[PDB]
Write a protein that binds this ligand. Structure first.
Ligand SMILES: CC(C)(C)c1cccc(C2(NC[C@@H](O)[C@H](Cc3cc(F)cc(F)c3)NC(=O)CC[C@@H](O)C(=O)O)CCCCC2)c1
Length: 374
């Protein structure tokens, strides 16, 4: 649903996943980062040391200026630019063309990456967190309003199998991309893709915190953030257990902070000493939830030059962010029509000789609604 969009994403480890788009008439081709954690469509529109190409408004007979500026601040990077509209399409995407809002980026700081291969960002979340304000229609809303594409997309983000790939199925769910059942969690509110974590286990041991801690101040699925990011108190409980699981090894302190590799001899990575992490999500029926299980092969992410890794779980003071390492090896369905996100085991699942990533349920969990913050 459909073959045409299967394997339509590419990326580098830790630099997001991008999809090919064209903007303007005639079509100008850009690579565009696929970001469930923001809601603005923006594209390099002026030279910058890190851009191979950029969008050229003067060459599009279909460009229209909105004569209004815009800027967006992310966790660290930020850009400013000029709002306009234009015709936009996705070559490996549905067969449609829309007029969508476009921020043309004229200045930026710490936003583009050195050898990135991407030139723009596709914020796929709801108008609410759009900049300057919720009146700037996000691209996906426009796509839905203009064409007949169903109000639904799914993301199959894959780890290696040194440089990566994946699929963005616009408008449905492609059955060849996952196994087992889909389990759905409610979208709590339509701004970020907000969800609610009702329970946390590490190698089968409940973390025993008040479930409010898991969602303080929000939990969101964010394909535009690399790490699993955890609220301070949860982060420290989790590192504690992960340290004691793996104490048979000697770890620098900068490792646990994400600012320093650990290396082992090719093929000898001590997989079995790192615990599995289970996240239980609110389910669709009363008192029911389901779990997703993350393997060490998701949260110790590989970087080149021996097999080398960074700890891809880190600290947040803006809530739980289920980033790209959590999403890898799941097929994640953003079912906007039904205010829900589905998780299944990805067809490109992460393997381990003795353990496997899993979406399992049903589980009973009382008082799930008390887990939400405010
Ligand atoms: C855009 C908006 C809505 C105002 C905003 C602001 C701050 C944080 C976010 C959130 N989404 C954040 C998400 O949009 C952005 C997209 C992005 C990807 C990129 F490659 C470079 C960037 F400059 C920006 N990603 C990041 O800021 C993290 C990037 C990097 O540190 C990494 O972890 O890989 C993250 C925290 C929880 C809320 C959602 C969103």
């Amino acid at each position: 649903s459909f073959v045409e969009m299967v394997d339509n994403l590419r990326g580098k480890s830790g630099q997001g996943y991008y999809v090919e788009m064209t903007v303007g008439s005639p079509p100008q081709t850009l690579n565009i980062l696929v970001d469930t954690g923001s809601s603005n469509f923006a594209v390099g529109a002026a030279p910058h040391p890190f851009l191979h190409r950029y969008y050229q408004r003067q060459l599009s007979s279909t460009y229209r200026d909105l004569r209004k500026g815009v800027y967006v601040p992310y966790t660290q990077g930020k850009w400013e630019g000029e709002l306009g509209t234009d015709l936009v399409s996705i070559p490996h995407g549905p067969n449609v063309t829309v007029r969508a809002n476009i921020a043309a980026i004229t200045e930026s700081d710490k936003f583009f990456i050195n050898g990135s291969n991407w030139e723009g960002i596709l914020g796929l979340a709801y108008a609410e967190i759009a900049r300057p304000d919720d009146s700037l229609e996000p691209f996906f809303d426009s796509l839905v309003k203009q064409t007949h594409v169903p109000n639904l997309f799914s993301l199959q983000l894959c780890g290696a199998g040194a440089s990566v790939g994946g699929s963005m199925i616009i408008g449905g769910i492609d059955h060849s991309l996952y196994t087992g059942s889909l389990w759905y969690t409610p979208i709590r509110r339509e701004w970020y893709y907000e969800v609610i974590i009702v329970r946390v286990e590490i190698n089968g041991q409940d973390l025993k915190m008040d479930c409010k801690e898991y969602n303080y101040d929000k939990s969101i699925v964010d394909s535009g953030t690399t790490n699993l990011r955890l609220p301070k108190k949860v982060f420290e409980a989790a590192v504690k257990s992960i340290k004691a699981a793996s104490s048979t090894e000697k770890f620098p302190d900068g490792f646990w902070l994400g600012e320093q590799l650990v290396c082992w001899q090719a093929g000898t990575t001590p997989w079995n000493i790192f615990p599995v992490i289970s996240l239980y999500l609110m389910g669709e029926v009363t008192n029911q939830s389901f779990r997703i299980t993350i393997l060490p092969q998701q949260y110790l992410r590989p970087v080149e030059d021996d097999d080398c890794y960074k700890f891809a779980i880190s600290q947040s003071s803006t809530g739980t962010v289920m980033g790209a390492v959590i999403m890898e090896g799941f097929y994640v369905v953003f079912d906007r029509a039904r205010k829900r996100i589905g998780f299944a085991v990805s067809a490109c699942h992460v393997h381990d000789e003795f353990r496997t990533a899993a979406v399992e349920g049903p589980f009973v969990t009382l008082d799930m609604e008390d887990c939400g913050y405010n």
